Every structure is written in C-alpha cells, then in structure tokens.
Write a protein that binds this ligand. Sequence first.
Ligand code: K
Ligand code: K
Ligand code: K
Ligand code: K
Lengths: 103, 93, 93, 103
Amino acid sequence: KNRIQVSNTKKPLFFYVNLAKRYMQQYNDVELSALGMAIATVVTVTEILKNNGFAVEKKIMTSIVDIKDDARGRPVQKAKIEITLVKSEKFDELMAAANEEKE
Amino acid sequence: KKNRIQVSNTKKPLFFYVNLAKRYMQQYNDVELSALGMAIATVVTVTEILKNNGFAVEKKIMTSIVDIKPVQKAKIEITLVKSEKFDELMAAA
Amino acid sequence: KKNRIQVSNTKKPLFFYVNLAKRYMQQYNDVELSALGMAIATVVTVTEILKNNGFAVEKKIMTSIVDIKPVQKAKIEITLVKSEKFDELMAAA
Amino acid sequence: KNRIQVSNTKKPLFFYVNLAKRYMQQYNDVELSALGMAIATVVTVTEILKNNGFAVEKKIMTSIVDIKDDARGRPVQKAKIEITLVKSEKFDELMAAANEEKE
Ligand SMILES: [K+]
Ligand SMILES: [K+]
Ligand SMILES: [K+]
Ligand SMILES: [K+]
C-alpha cells in the first residue's frame, strides 16, 4: 500500500516526492525502491525529505540482485536500493505551513 | 525507428545500450539514442564511452523540454556515426 | 560568470542549485546552468522543477562533447528566464 | 590505499572502472564511495564489474550523513554509498583474455 517503485522516466521528480509525502501522511511510513539508473531518484527524494524536515530514515538497504533477462540468456545483475522513511515530528507542522495553516 | 535506441528500462545494464549502439552502427552506420529525464545520464555515458574508446563520432546532440500528457521533461537525442577506427575495433573484439 | 551556476559539487543538496537559480533570476532575470557528465542529471532536474512549478522558461539548451585536458565529456548549458508567474511565486514563498 | 571516492565530474566512467580493476589486482579488494549524484557512478561501476565477471561484492552500505555546510549554517544531509568488492575467481583469466593472453 505504501510502496513506491521508481522506474518510469516520464515522471517528474516531484511526483515521487509528493507520493512519498502522501504515503507518510496516510501510513506513517513509506518504502521507496529502485534499480540502476533510478537509484539516483530515490536518493534525491530521500535527501529532499530529510533536509526539509519531513522524514527520518529507518532503513536503507542496497544490494545486487539477479534480474531475469531473456535476450541475455541468463540473469543480469543490477543494484537495487530500498529505503523506508517515517514521518518526522515536524511533518504535520510543515505540511500545514506549506499553506500558511500553522497555529 | 530501426536505428533508434530509446533508453527507458531501469533493469538493463549499461553495456546493453553500449553494445546495442555498436550493433546498430555496424548495420546502419549511424545510431540515434534518446531518453527522458533520469535516463539522460545513461545516454550521456553511452556517448562518452563510444567517443573515448574510439568507436564513434557525434553528428547531432539535441536537448529540449517536451510535454508529456501536462508535465514537462527534458529529452536528449544523440546521433552517432562510425569513426574511422570502428571496423577495426569491432574485428579486434 | 555572475549569473552562471556550474554544478560540480556532489556534497550539495539539489535544492541548493534550485534556490540559487531562483535567486539569480531575481537579480539578472536569466540564469545559465552548466555541468559535465554525471552532473548533467542535476541540471536537467533543476530545469524540470523550475519549468513544472511555473518559475522559469528555457531560452537555450546546448549539449555538446568537450575535450578535458584528452578525455571527452558531455556538457550541458541551459539558459533560463523568469516566467510571467515568477515574481508572484517568489512573493508567495 | 585501495579507496576510490567518486566526486570529479571531469572523469570518464572508465577511469573509475579501470582504477577499481587496478586496486583489485594489487590488493584483492577495493572500496568505492560517493555522495548524492555520484552514487549512480559507483552503482554503475559495480554493475559493470559484476556482470562482466571481475568482482564479487562483499559489503554495500548506504546511509544518510551530515556534511558541514558554511553557507547553510548547519550541516546538510546527503546519501553516501560505500561498496567493497573483491576479486572474483575469473578476474585473472578475464584480465589476461582482454589481451588474448589466456592459456
Ligand atoms: K489553521
Ligand atoms: K529501434
Ligand atoms: K556565478
Ligand atoms: K599468455
């Protein structure tokens, strides 16, 4: 329910940042994952959410996985990152303040 | 289309695209590489590799902002041709 | 030089470059962003953000291969200008 | 002695791949590290060395670190990756075969 897999090169960065914010709001945590070239996206989303006070990381796992590859004839190996973020203590205030709604 | 490589698969290893570019140059002489957004880095790297290792010469490198059904994304389009060393490098491989 | 941002520092957060571009546009109207190789992805992303969020319009996007004292690297050069909404977005911030 | 930090945007990818090969040849292992945008480089070097039979990973650590930042006035947070690779059992044969020197 709260998992985001980054793989669509058509999506703007803020699609993923905003989805991560929505999932943290709904579920308290969010899991981001990506392979290969998409790892830079997950890293950047995480940096943004940390530097701007929205999130605290709970788990960052990075590993090499086998990917089935028909044309190759045997699996290819790719790096995969998996990041779990939880809501920070400032998340609600910051989401409020975005729209000048802090009390 | 036949000699165009669109880079959009995060499951592929880099060398998939490097080798595909070399195979396309063997048949068509020239090769078009295109990508959006986060995939531009791969196209750039493919190009650098083919240039630095003596396989290719660039003919055209176009970067622009495009609308996707709308959101805006950067798109790169690179056209490469065989270098004077290409055939000998391929034979040596 | 004064209104050019070279992206080459891996220690910087993305929003360093996004905010610097916005500050430069406030003073100069327009801003040049440049990078090599692995940094091109950052320039692309900065640009997409400034376009998608209504701050900027692109005027020029140049990608080329350059010699570095030699090895060849891709280099992007983007020029942005303020959009019609820029001043109001900055005031609202 | 065997550490490679990826941070120079002037370097071609194969500078890092070839340095990693040299360090594995000399020391049996190599440590690759990078922050932020440079993580994609380390990931790609690792994929290359794995898919092509040169290396086996031993450790991949990915974390958020504080970076001193004068202009900011307090530290910024960046993702950092640290990858330790060791020579594979095929490394020597492959380095030989590169130059048609296998026996
Ligand atoms: K309120
Ligand atoms: K094709
Ligand atoms: K400047
Ligand atoms: K021999």
